[PDB]
Amino acid sequence: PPPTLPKPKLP
Amino acid sequence: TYRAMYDYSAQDEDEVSFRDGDYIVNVQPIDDGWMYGTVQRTGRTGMLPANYIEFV
Ligand SMILES: [Zn+2]
């Protein structure tokens, strides 16, 4: 499966 | 509702694991990388990688 992108700390 | 295109193992406490073919319900986009949703099969709610899931 593909790489994931950076997480966001919400908001 | 969306459907997973790949298996995924959660990599942090705010994420959820799922399998290819899983229905994901009450999905809310967060940004381009991530969404919130509930994995119907397991009943777990949290963050999912948006690029692993497809709408409808
Ligand atoms: Zn952690």
mmCIF file of C-alpha atoms and ligand atoms in Angstrom:
data_model
loop_
_atom_site.group_PDB
_atom_site.id
_atom_site.type_symbol
_atom_site.label_atom_id
_atom_site.label_comp_id
_atom_site.label_asym_id
_atom_site.label_seq_id
_atom_site.Cartn_x
_atom_site.Cartn_y
_atom_site.Cartn_z
ATOM 1 C CA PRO A 1 0.000 0.000 0.000
ATOM 2 C CA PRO A 2 1.098 3.625 -0.508
ATOM 3 C CA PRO A 3 2.975 5.874 1.952
ATOM 4 C CA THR A 4 0.879 7.990 4.289
ATOM 5 C CA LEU A 5 1.155 11.772 4.493
ATOM 6 C CA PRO A 6 2.052 13.740 7.629
ATOM 7 C CA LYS A 7 -0.610 13.771 10.338
ATOM 8 C CA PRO A 8 -2.296 16.951 11.364
ATOM 9 C CA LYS A 9 -2.672 17.894 15.029
ATOM 10 C CA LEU A 10 -6.224 19.241 14.902
ATOM 11 C CA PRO A 11 -7.134 21.923 14.339
ATOM 12 C CA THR B 1 -19.723 5.846 3.466
ATOM 13 C CA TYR B 2 -16.397 4.854 1.874
ATOM 14 C CA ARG B 3 -14.572 1.556 1.284
ATOM 15 C CA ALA B 4 -10.943 0.689 2.075
ATOM 16 C CA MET B 5 -8.727 -0.211 -0.895
ATOM 17 C CA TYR B 6 -5.897 -1.640 1.243
ATOM 18 C CA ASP B 7 -5.228 -3.094 4.666
ATOM 19 C CA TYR B 8 -3.878 -0.635 7.225
ATOM 20 C CA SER B 9 -2.407 -1.098 10.706
ATOM 21 C CA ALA B 10 -2.813 1.906 13.007
ATOM 22 C CA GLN B 11 0.498 3.665 13.748
ATOM 23 C CA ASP B 12 -0.676 5.931 16.577
ATOM 24 C CA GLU B 13 -3.318 5.966 19.301
ATOM 25 C CA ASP B 14 -5.639 8.239 17.306
ATOM 26 C CA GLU B 15 -5.677 5.975 14.233
ATOM 27 C CA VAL B 16 -7.750 2.919 13.413
ATOM 28 C CA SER B 17 -6.830 -0.327 11.661
ATOM 29 C CA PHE B 18 -8.838 -1.817 8.788
ATOM 30 C CA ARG B 19 -8.810 -4.296 5.935
ATOM 31 C CA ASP B 20 -9.201 -4.032 2.187
ATOM 32 C CA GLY B 21 -12.948 -3.962 1.455
ATOM 33 C CA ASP B 22 -14.009 -2.552 4.827
ATOM 34 C CA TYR B 23 -16.890 -0.073 4.860
ATOM 35 C CA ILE B 24 -15.990 3.161 6.613
ATOM 36 C CA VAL B 25 -18.988 5.143 7.868
ATOM 37 C CA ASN B 26 -19.603 8.732 8.961
ATOM 38 C CA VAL B 27 -16.506 9.882 7.195
ATOM 39 C CA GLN B 28 -15.312 13.451 7.624
ATOM 40 C CA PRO B 29 -12.311 14.761 5.639
ATOM 41 C CA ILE B 30 -9.663 16.479 7.819
ATOM 42 C CA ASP B 31 -7.086 17.493 5.286
ATOM 43 C CA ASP B 32 -5.665 15.958 2.121
ATOM 44 C CA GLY B 33 -3.920 13.088 3.993
ATOM 45 C CA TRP B 34 -6.388 12.041 6.669
ATOM 46 C CA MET B 35 -10.065 11.569 7.462
ATOM 47 C CA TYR B 36 -12.134 10.695 10.547
ATOM 48 C CA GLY B 37 -14.411 7.707 10.325
ATOM 49 C CA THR B 38 -15.764 4.532 11.890
ATOM 50 C CA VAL B 39 -14.619 1.101 10.663
ATOM 51 C CA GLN B 40 -18.018 -0.656 10.531
ATOM 52 C CA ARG B 41 -16.585 -4.157 10.926
ATOM 53 C CA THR B 42 -14.655 -3.433 14.150
ATOM 54 C CA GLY B 43 -16.707 -0.523 15.520
ATOM 55 C CA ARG B 44 -13.569 1.603 16.040
ATOM 56 C CA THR B 45 -13.577 5.347 15.327
ATOM 57 C CA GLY B 46 -10.532 7.497 14.620
ATOM 58 C CA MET B 47 -8.181 8.748 11.941
ATOM 59 C CA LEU B 48 -7.674 6.922 8.628
ATOM 60 C CA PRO B 49 -5.316 7.699 5.757
ATOM 61 C CA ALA B 50 -7.456 9.293 3.047
ATOM 62 C CA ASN B 51 -5.392 7.754 0.269
ATOM 63 C CA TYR B 52 -6.344 4.247 1.426
ATOM 64 C CA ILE B 53 -10.108 4.754 1.097
ATOM 65 C CA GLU B 54 -12.471 5.373 -1.793
ATOM 66 C CA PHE B 55 -15.869 7.121 -1.677
ATOM 67 C CA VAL B 56 -19.065 5.051 -2.050
HETATM 68 ZN ZN ZN C 1 1.351 8.027 20.161
#
